[PDB]
Structure 1
Amino acid sequence: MEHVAFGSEDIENTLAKMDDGQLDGLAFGAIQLDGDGNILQYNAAQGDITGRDPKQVIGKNFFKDVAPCTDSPEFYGKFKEGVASGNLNTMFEYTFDYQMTPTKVKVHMKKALSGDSYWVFVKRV
């Protein structure tokens, strides 16, 4: 188990050292997106929450293909403003309900340290 707490102030520095195997040891769901919303990384805890198979969703677009319930001003709209501005750090509750039992989660979106990548972190509430 990797010990990093959800919501930690310097989480992007800590997660910069992990490969996909290490990300699978986190206590919470983690998705890495490019600035178009394509999925680059998707960990085991996220798949436990959503039912998706991690290897199968890498390369898909999160907003168009995987998670249409997030294509809303309340989720996608926040992401796209962050990508446009080059800064993003926001936490909110949301319900995931596409092809699954409706599940309430806490979401933390934060710009990654390097380049044009963005984290989505998720835990149950």
Structure 2
Amino acid sequence: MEHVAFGSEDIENTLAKMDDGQLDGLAFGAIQLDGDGNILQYNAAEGDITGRDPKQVIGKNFFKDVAPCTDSPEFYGKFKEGVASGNLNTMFEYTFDYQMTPTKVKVHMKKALSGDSYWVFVKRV
């Protein structure tokens, strides 16, 4: 076995129905979004490094109301491509340095199978 897997234990499935402790003990924050970039879920992993938390970032747009860096052609860019492609599936090396310290993370976002969503999993590096 290797370290925590990015795709990990079928996140999307565990994020549509949640797991034991809402699978918040992962190493990659799992966030969802609804046709606009409105957070649907966030989990405690990423929210534990920055403190965002889901109940707090709930309603906050993860593109401009939570992270002002994801509103670019590399983060929201591949998101506007996956949303218009009908199968969001992209990743990229990003750095969360918003009002805080310099964070590094390998991102991996895909099209949630809940019916039509968009989740961005950030795996701290």
- Which TM-score applies when normalising by structure 2? 0.84
What does residue 95 of structure 1 align with?
95
| CA distance in structure 1 between the partners assigned to 2:11 and 2:53 by the alignment | 24
CA 20–35 in structure 1, closer or farther in 2 if over 3 Å, else same? farther
Partner-residue secondary structure (3-state), 2:64: helix
Aligned to 1:11: 11
- Give 1:82 deviation, angstroms: 0.9
What is the rounded CA distance, in whole Å, between the counterparts of 1:45 and 1:2 in structure 2?
19
Identity of aligned residues (%): 99
More strand by share: 1
Listed as ranges, the matches of 1:2-81 within 5 Å are 5-8=5-8, 10-18=10-18, 21-81=21-81
Contact 1:112 1:119 in 2 (8 A): yes
SS of match in other structure, 1:20: coil
Q: Please list the CA deviations of residues 61-107 of structure 1 after superposition, one character each: whole Å capped at 9, or x if unmatched.
A: 11121101111111111101111121111121101111011111010
* Structure 2: runs of 5+ lacking an equivalent: none
Could you tell me whether the CA contact under 8 Å between 1:29 and 1:49 is conserved in 2?
no
- Deviation (angstroms), 1:53: 3.3
Please, which runs of 5 or more residues in structure 1 have no aligned partner? none
User: Is the contact made by 1:31 and 1:121 (CA closer than 8 Å) also made in structure 2?
Assistant: yes
Q: Per the alignment, do residues 53 and 22 of structure 1 end up closer, same or farther by CA in structure 2, a change over 3 Å counting?
A: closer
Q: TM-score, normalised by structure 1?
A: 0.84
Tell me how far apart the structure 1 counterparts of residues 23 and 2 of structure 2 sit (CA, whole Å): 8
Equivalences, count: 125
Range moving further from structure 2, 26-35 or 7-16? 7-16
Change (3 A) 1:27 1:97: closer
CA 1:14–1:20 in structure 2 vs 1: closer, same or farther (change >3 Å)? closer
